Design a protein around this ligand. Structure first.
Ligand SMILES: [Cl-]
Lengths: 932, 139
């Protein structure tokens, strides 16, 4: 059984050097692959294992030298498989790739940092191995920026990082498999403890095989409640315990620069928001009942976690010396009816006052859970609302009383233990863990107000000009008469909108965040949501957040927001705070990526100018994809790259589902995520990036013109482009496939304009081509190099000295690292008409030229020259991904073309090609993670 | 009960039906589910007070100062319109709140319990239209 020696040789040939000396990635992945292949031999036979290992070896040789002969060598094997063998092989490479990710995570979490590797500039913030931790950021602020420790502390006090969980564009990984990945990571890490005993190591090996098999032997498009349940798992996994540890580390770093206070436990440095069950944009499956469900489910998970956390808190709080105030409350609580701690104590006596009060809190938490459960499964309760906590103050008040009393009695250290962590958990997570944003297209609000005005015999709000719409909406917001009643013809859509508002109205305000308007263009959209909110009797209306998607919408955004701030009603409703959302993926679908990047920098600049004008605190909400959508260290520089004063201590970022596991799956990875978001926000508030030189802005304006020209000329002007897109890519199968929880085309008939951003990026990411990400950069850089000899030098200056530019270029280079034109050529050869075959050749030439020009700008000879660790990990995944690519291509040809008969091979073991296609989609998706 | 009566007559048992059953049917028809139907009575002046607080709240003037013809015209324009009149945002005196709450209680009970809404000190059609409008706008 000498197969391990060969896979060892191929892994060492794929990743030759050591990116450090704790570089155990090759060792880790070799171990996981040996154990997996032994299990595979045991379950589906020797023949299956030999076939699989032959496929992987060819894949590694290809990712070695990129010989096109290797790809046909893979294909000859993969097409001769009957659907059963195809499914077993595809499943196998999916789990192998997953194991590579798990090993990769262990490497990242236990890679020792290097102090001597820091260069001293902003480039260090692009990798976790050199980025500034919390305290290095403090000493950067104190030494270089001449900020006082008091100023840093006060900034932290008023800072908020708000992380928004969004639905996975594909497989939102089930909670059970998250747990299994956790056990696998734990077993790996412990197996490499330089102190492990022989028996412990054997039992760890046996647990590792056991877990790999457990994950490999498990097989609707999950209901939005199920996907939400799955998306919330990271709170149980790492975030709940991780948050108080991080805040405590903030306290320590403050003590180490002379600050004697701790960060106030009620200061919302960390907040969590969710779109799961709230985003309705082109998703009729997200109903009012779905939103109510995920709201109550969230309140349930929160009550459970607080309930379970408060018993160990009750065990710790056994003191007797206390406040006069606390003693009064304890004697008060002692006057009542003790069912949830009989296993611990028959009853809580009055000489343990903290235990009395805390026991009453535990009882109210129990009634809170049971009521939320009763509302969820029925629609009414009988549990008195006064016997529960309804707002955060009812909850915080007795805990704060305990804290005051303990400090009163010289027991402050005890208070800074389980109690401080608990208080910080209540402040971070509230009664819901997350606050749900609601998202809907503006057009639906136009439809509702149009049915309303037509019903009042005043005309059609839709035909009205923007100014007339604003004037009517303003006259209604300032009036006292209601707008409509039950007597109102509602279409299914109009009734959905109003019913969603009624459900928001009947639920606690702690569950909701922002009302997000998709395709927002004008102030009347924002006023429409505010009016519909008020007239549906929502007592505390949500803050309305416009989403400006298209490029023209971005240009018109600061005028519309200034006009909104200028009207007295909206100015008194917002009370000096406004949140605006900009969409990177969406805008890229409109006008290419380079143009969306520069337009979003300028648009944020102008929005900040308006916000300073009217005295409003602006919060920029960064949607999905983009430069702000990356994993790990790059994000630190991403945040540092935003224009000066666009953050100002209030950051709101989408954590894309395709990165959320790499970011919160493990204890260390999670802690470092929270650390870098907080540190980059704090530093940016006190140390903005440089203002761009005037020639830099002129150069980017021209490049923006050329890049949007090329992008629209290929994507939108070419007549046969849509046919090519439907052939050289699995877009049709992705939409038909019940994969994306929502549908792809907003209007089923329409073109790419109506195609959503997620399938737009996905379709080209599956083929390792990524055209929506890089297209346009080529002609823009060619144009400026040819127009003036010196512009290359200017470009190289920007990449070296302008953070915004460096992060934009860095993203293009990274996406090219995940690209391989040869595989794309295979897709062309199998799936595209001969009439249309030369077209892909031209686009591929553009791919190569764009790659060379990006290298020239970054001063690099190879891709990712500055981040060898990431190059290593990506090169590792590519060996598995390439196999899922070839399998997906031939499977597509077999699905579309029943006239393509293959010489099948005999069944292998196990002692429908649609399923295999879905496997390859999920696999390739999991191996490429984030692109644009 | 009517089914029982039909069946009994079908089977030549009409006399049996004209016994305890006929008496029972006649008791259901006379007394309904309530024995009595409740009339509600209130002075018209209280309706003038309620509509006056409503129009003053809408910045249109005082229904009380309005002539009888102007009152009729406004009430008729509201009964023929589709927009509601007022909401929770309405300064109610103890009396005005009593009137509206009485309407809400009538609204939440079966129609078999109620008869007629009686306007004391009635003098003009606007009193009758005032009760009809207050009835409709309290759902
Ligand atoms: Cl989207």
């Amino acid at each position: 059984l000498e197969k391990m020696a060969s896979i060892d040789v191929h892994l060492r040939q794929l990743v030759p050097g050591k990116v450090s000396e704790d570089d155990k990635l090759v060792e880790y992945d070799a171990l996981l692959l040996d154990r997996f292949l032994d299990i595979l031999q045991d379950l589906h036979g020797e023949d299956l294992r030999e076939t699989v290992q032959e496929l992987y070896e060819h894949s590694a040789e290809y990712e070695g030298k990129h010989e096109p002969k290797k790809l046909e060598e893979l294909g000859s094997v993969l097409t001769s498989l009957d659907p059963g063998d195809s499914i077993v092989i595809a499943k196998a490479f999916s789990h192998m790739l997953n194991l590579a990710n798990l090993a990769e995570e262990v490497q990242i979490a236990y890679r020792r940092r290097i102090k001597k590797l820091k260069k001293g500039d902003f480039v260090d913030e692009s990798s976790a191995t050199t980025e500034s931790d919390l305290e290095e950021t403090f000493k950067k602020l104190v030494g270089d920026l001449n900020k006082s420790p008091e100023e840093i502390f006060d900034a932290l006090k008023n800072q908020t990082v708000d992380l928004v969980l969004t639905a996975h564009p594909t497989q939102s990984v089930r909670r059970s498999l998250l747990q299994k990945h956790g056990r696998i990571r734990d077993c790996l890490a412990q197996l490499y403890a330089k102190d492990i005993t022989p028996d412990d190591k054997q039992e760890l090996d046996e647990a590792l095989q056991r877990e790999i098999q457990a994950a490999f032997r498990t097989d609707t498009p999950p209901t939005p409640q199920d996907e939400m349940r799955a998306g919330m798992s990271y709170f149980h996994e790492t975030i709940w315990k991780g948050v108080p540890k991080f805040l405590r580390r903030v306290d320590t770093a403050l003590k180490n620069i002379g600050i004697e206070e701790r960060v106030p436990y009620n200061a919302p440095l960390i907040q969590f928001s969710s779109w799961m069950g709230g985003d309705r944009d082109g998703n009729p499956r997200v109903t009012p009942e779905v939103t109510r469900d995920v709201c109550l489910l969230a309140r349930m998970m929160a009550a459970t976690m607080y309930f379970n956390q408060i018993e160990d808190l009750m065990f710790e709080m056994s003191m007797w010396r206390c406040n006069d105030e606390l003693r009064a409350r304890a004697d008060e609580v002692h006057a009542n009816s003790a069912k949830h701690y009989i296993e611990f104590w028959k009853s809580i006596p009055t000489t343990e006052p903290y235990r009395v009060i805390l026991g009453d809190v535990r009882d109210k938490l129990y009634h809170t859970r049971e009521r939320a459960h009763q509302l969820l499964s029925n629609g009414h309760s009988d549990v008195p609302v006064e016997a529960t906590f309804i707002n955060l103050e009812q909850f915080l008040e007795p805990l704060e009383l305990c804290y005051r009393s303990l400090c009163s009695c010289g027991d402050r250290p005890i208070a800074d233990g389980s109690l401080l962590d608990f208080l910080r958990q209540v402040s971070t997570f509230g009664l819901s863990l997350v606050r749900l944003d609601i998202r809907q297209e503006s057009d639906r609000h136009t439809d509702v107000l149009d049915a309303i005005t037509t019903h009042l015999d005043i005309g059609s709000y839709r035909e009205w000009s923007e100014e007339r719409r604003q004037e009517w909406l303003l006259s209604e917001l300032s009036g006292k008469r209601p707008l409509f009643g039950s007597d109102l013809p509602k279409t299914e859509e109009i009734a959905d909108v109003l019913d969603t508002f009624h459900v928001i109205a009947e639920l606690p305000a702690d569950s909701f965040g922002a009302y997000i308007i998709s395709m927002a263009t004008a102030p009347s959209d924002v006023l429409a949501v505010e009016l519909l909110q008020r007239e549906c009797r929502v007592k505390q209306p949500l803050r309305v957040v416009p989403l400006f998607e298209k490029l023209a919408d971005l240009e018109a955004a600061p005028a519309a927001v200034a006009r909104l701030f200028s009207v007295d009603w909206y100015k008194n409703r917002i009370n000096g705070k406004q949140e605006v959302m900009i969409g990177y993926s969406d805008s890229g679908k409109d006008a290419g990526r380079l143009s969306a990047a520069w337009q979003l920098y300028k648009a944020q600049e102008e929005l900040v100018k308006v916000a300073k004008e009217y005295g409003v605190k602006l919060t920029m909400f960064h949607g999905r994809g983009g430069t702000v959508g990356r994993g790990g260290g790059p994000t630190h520089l991403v945040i540092l790259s935003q224009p000066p004063d666009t953050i100002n201590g209030s950051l709101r970022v989408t954590v894309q589902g395709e990165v959320i596991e790499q970011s919160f799956g493990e204890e260390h990875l999670c802690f470092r995520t929270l650390q870098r978001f907080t540190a980059a926000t704090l530093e940016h508030g006190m140390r903005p990036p440089i203002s761009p030189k005037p020639e830099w802005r002129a150069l980017l304006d021209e490049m923006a013109v050329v890049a949007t020209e090329e992008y629209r000329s290929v994507v939108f002007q070419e007549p046969r482009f849509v046919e090519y897109f439907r052939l050289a890519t699995p877009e049709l199968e992705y939409g038909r496939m019940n994969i994306g929880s929502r549908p792809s085309k907003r209007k089923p008939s329409g073109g790419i304009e109506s195609l959503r951003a997620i399938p737009w990026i996905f379709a080209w990411t599956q083929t390792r081509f990524h055209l929506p990400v890089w297209l346009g950069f080529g002609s823009a850089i060619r144009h400026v190099i040819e127009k003036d000899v010196r512009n290359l030098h200017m470009l190289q200056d920007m990449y070296q000295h302008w953070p915004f530019f460096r992060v934009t270029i860095d993203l293009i280079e990274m996406v090219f690292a995940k690209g391989d034109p040869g595989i794309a050529a295979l897709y062309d050869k199998l799936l595209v008409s001969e009439e249309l075959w030369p077209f892909g050749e031209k686009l591929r030439a553009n791919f190569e030229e764009t790659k060379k020009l990006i290298l020239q700008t970054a001063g690099h000879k190879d891709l990712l020259e500055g981040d060898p660790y990431l190059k290593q990990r990506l090169r590792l995944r590519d060996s598995y991904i390439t196999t899922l690519n070839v399998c997906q291509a031939y499977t597509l040809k077999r699905i579309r073309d029943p006239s393509y008969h293959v010489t099948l091979r005999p069944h292998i073991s196990k002692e429908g090609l649609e399923d295999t296609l879905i496997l390859t989609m999920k696999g390739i998706a999991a191996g490429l993670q984030n692109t644009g």
